[PDB]
Swiss-Prot record, chains A, B:
Segments forming a coiled coil: none
Whole sequence portion shown: 3264 to 3565 of 4405
Active site: 41 (for 3cl-pro activity), 145 (for 3cl-pro activity)
Protein name as catalogued: 3C-like proteinase nsp5
Effect of residue 49 to A: Does not affect ability to cleave and inactivate human TRMT1
Length: 302, 302
């Protein structure tokens, strides 16, 4: 028993992390086969970040301007290529520690593990959700840029995220491994609006199921509700609309606990309307939305 | 910026995790050099756990009764030895992936990373504190027993914890790697009292410093206080007494933020007495005590 926010084991990803240096700039890169992936703003000084013409900036750079190191092992670069907001540095040496891997673009509400690095050196690991407004609430310092988010499906590492920017807000923005930003964000040091940060309703419900599985059943009410009635309450509290697909995804958890989804929705309704009255659920005084149904079942079953 | 509960990278520990089977019982073991460490209750059936005579139970077992596997690689056992509550299974093959390592007994209030396994297979990683009552709030299922807690000091993995028991309470108990339980607990399926679960005051303060470093400064009050006056309030709310050593440990954080320890203590006093009034600190509606000063500085500096 017990329920913790839990990252995937990071070993497979640790052996892929390298230091990418270009001029004065140094950050973290991802070394897979004979290609190193990194934020394209590695070519930028601090002054360039205000209004960068990446194409023009990149043209001053040749292969030899990129120092790629993998812990005292300086790789050699034999070809470079900008793909959207990522640089792809071809190298002579293929990473012998390359895991089975995929590149995937993740959806809002889905979770992933972040291996936070500094200048190519793994520092630690934590679990994140891609929030509805396509930000994450991470922990990244100078050097962390190029730190990656991933999921592990049995043997395959699925890379979904690379960290690029910290907003003036403090929250974090990044790309998939093809270099496309999650959200409207750009790799430019300017004012950038993250939208309203809504809550992932299906996750909150998954978490409430986890709490019941773990013996916290106090919230369970004597009411029920419909989707419409629930969603009218959801919209009020900047919660995501709950759809039928959401209900279906929660079915296994419903089947395990013997609690229908709408019954659990009614519990959530009252919690939202009436608060927690100073009580806690799974050792939290807030409604938590960074656990997917998959995460709950993964941690509960095996 | 940003502040997250963060585990150490687990790669070094992943390559040490093995499956230990004895009769019907299977759990996780730690393979270091030519020795495998595991909970001694691996020799127990469910019936034995009620009132085990470990010495008598172990005598029925010979070397060949222990099946040690490291992912399709069945190790061979050439000597066995019970050390307190751990079994030490000597084997022919030395782990080639043995990291630089130490065994350390950790103190109450100190943190560590748990690599949660099932039957020798790493499942995930999260950060824990050894609580004042020598329990942890983990996540362990059947198979997780023998999962280990560790810290990484640059090159050296320092193993501090092995998971053995879940209490009827739900909270978790275990040993150091020499097999001595943290706390009064025994490896017997019986009713076992964990004491009053007090809060780690120096950690809470470390966390409050982290919050100020990250821009949450709302709690900061116009008062100050003494240690005695503070500790009289601390005792009331089952907080650990704050000592002078605690003050000294917080000095760097005090020096960074320009906020004296006692000034921060007065903030904490009011929070304890007046609550949070529905506000949050670092995205939490509770006072968090599982971040040491080291953890805060590690994550803030680099």
């Amino acid at each position: 028993s017990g329920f913790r926010k839990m990252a995937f084991p990071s070993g497979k990803v640790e052996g892929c992390m390298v230091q990418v240096t270009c001029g004065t700039t140094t950050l973290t890169g991802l070394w897979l086969d004979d290609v190193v992936y990194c934020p394209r703003h590695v070519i930028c000084t601090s002054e360039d970040m205000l209004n960068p013409n990446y194409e023009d900036l990149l043209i001053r750079k040749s292969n030899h301007n990129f120092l790629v190191q993998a812990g005292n092992v300086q790789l050699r670069v034999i070809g470079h290529s900008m793909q959207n907001c990522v640089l792809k540095l071809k190298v002579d040496t293929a990473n012998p520690k390359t895991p089975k891997y995929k590149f995937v673009r993740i959806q809002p509400g889905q979770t992933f593990s972040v291996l936070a690095c500094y200048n190519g050196s793994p520092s630690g690991v934590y679990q994140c959700a891609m929030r509805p407004n396509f930000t994450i609430k991470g922990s990244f310092l100078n050097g962390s840029c190029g730190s990656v988010g991933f999921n592990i499906d049995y043997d395959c590492v699925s890379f979904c995220y690379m960290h690029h920017m910290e907003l003036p807000t403090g929250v974090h923005a990044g790309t998939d491994l093809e270099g496309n930003f999650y959200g409207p964000f750009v790799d430019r040091q300017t004012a950038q609006a993250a939208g309203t940060d809504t809550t992932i309703t299906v996750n909150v419900l998954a978490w409430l199921y986890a709490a019941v599985i773990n013996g916290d059943r106090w919230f369970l009410n004597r009411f029920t509700t419909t989707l419409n009635d629930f969603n009218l309450v959801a919209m009020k509290y900047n919660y995501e609309p709950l759809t039928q697909d959401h209900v279906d995804i929660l079915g296994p958890l419903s089947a395990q606990t013997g609690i229908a989804v709408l019954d659990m929705c009614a519990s959530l309704k009252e919690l939202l309307q009436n608060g927690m009255n100073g009580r806690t659920i799974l050792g939290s005084a807030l409604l938590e939305d960074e656990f997917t149904p998959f995460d709950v079942v993964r941690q509960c079953s095996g």
